Amino acid sequence: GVAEVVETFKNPGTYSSPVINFKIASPPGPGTPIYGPPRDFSGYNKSYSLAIGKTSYYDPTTGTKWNDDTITPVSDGQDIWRGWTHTGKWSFFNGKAGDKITLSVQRDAQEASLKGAHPGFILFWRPEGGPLFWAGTQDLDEGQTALPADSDTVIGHVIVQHADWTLQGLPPKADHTAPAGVDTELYPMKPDSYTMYYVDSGYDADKYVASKKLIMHPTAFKGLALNDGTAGAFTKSITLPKTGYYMLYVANVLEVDDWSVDADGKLTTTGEVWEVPAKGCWVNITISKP
Ligand SMILES: [Ca+2]
Ligand SMILES: [Cu+2]
Numbered sequence: 001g002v003a004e005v006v007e008t009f010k011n012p013g014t015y016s017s018p019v020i021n022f023k024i025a026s027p028p029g030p031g032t033p034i035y036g037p038p039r040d041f042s043g044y045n046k047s048y049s050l051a052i053g054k055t056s057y058y059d060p061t062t063g064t065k066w067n068d069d070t071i072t073p074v075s076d077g078q079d080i081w082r083g084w085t086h087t088g089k090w091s092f093f094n095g096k097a098g099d100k101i102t103l104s105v106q107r108d109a110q111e112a113s114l115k116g117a118h119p120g121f122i123l124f125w126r127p128e129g130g131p132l133f134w135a136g137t138q139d140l141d142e143g144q145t146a147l148p149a150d151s152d153t154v155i156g157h158v159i160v161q162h163a164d165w166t167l168q169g170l171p172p173k174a175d176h177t178a179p180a181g182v183d184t185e186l187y188p189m190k191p192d193s194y195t196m197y198y199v200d201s202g203y204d205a206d207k208y209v210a211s212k213k214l215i216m217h218p219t220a221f222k223g224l225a226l227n228d229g230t231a232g233a234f235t236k237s238i239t240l241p242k243t244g245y246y247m248l249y250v251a252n253v254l255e256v257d258d259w260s261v262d263a264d265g266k267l268t269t270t271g272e273v274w275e276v277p278a279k280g281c282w283v284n285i286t287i288s289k290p
């Protein structure tokens with residue numbers, strides 16, 4: 001591994017390369033929007049707070065699973081539920097090859113004792129070096145010549161958490177470029193495709209109640225479990241493999257007594273750990289150096 005998941009563009013569609021926003025902080029509602037500052041962690045020792053949806057990270061409500069064909073036995077890599085792109089929250093940073101940093105997500109100071117959050121993340125590298133405008137994708141098909149402020153494209157509405165992610169069949173694009181340094185044999189710049197290269201991912205595996213279980217796959221994400229004895233938080237050391245622009249996705253794993261997905265793919269749970277206030281589930285992402 002890692003697996004590579006290859007999507008086929010379709011607009012309207014799940015894999016329509018929709019735009020994400022780096023300020024939106026309010027929970028999966030509307031609800032009435034809350035926007036904060038853009039979550040740029042460039043320079044590091046930055047920290048931002050925002051709300052994450054109940055099952056966003058490993059999300060049966062997506063009705064979508066993928067499978068990871070790089071796991072032996074392949075049985076162990078199947079029916080991996082996707083995360084939701086838009087009930088997670090997106091951030092970015094610019095950085096340098098070899099940069100040694102530490103990512104921490106934990107319950108927000110003001111929710112410090114409410115049980116619920118089991119944050120996880122995915123970190124991607126975008127060899128294009130910056131936000132990617134692509135005309136004819138979902139939210140850029142109305143004559144736009146640029147991305148809206150504080151926004152960027154991602155492949156689709158339901159995301160893979162342990163794979164390189166490729167979109168193919170895009171409206172032909174003559175200016176799909178990378179900067180001078182990028183090895184375009186390893187990281188090709190296609191007229192009709194782009195890839196989000198996997199960097200790292202993990203989630204908080206510490207339960208609030210040892211008898212309970214996480215809405216999480218039995219085996220496929222074994223390498224991604226993060227255990228530190230503290231429910232509601234994880235920390236992770238990350239060395240940046242490349243110079244340039246990184247895209248960070250953070251979302252939530254839900255703890256339950258039991259859960260089930262019925263024939264019509266409806267999600268049911270019992271005994272949810274979810275003591276979450278009117279304002280929603282708030283976490284704080286900090287990237288520090290070191
Ligand atoms: Ca933990
Ligand atoms: Cu979405």
Ligand SMILES: [Hg+2]
Nearest residue numbers: 116117276281
């Ligand atoms: Hg919560």
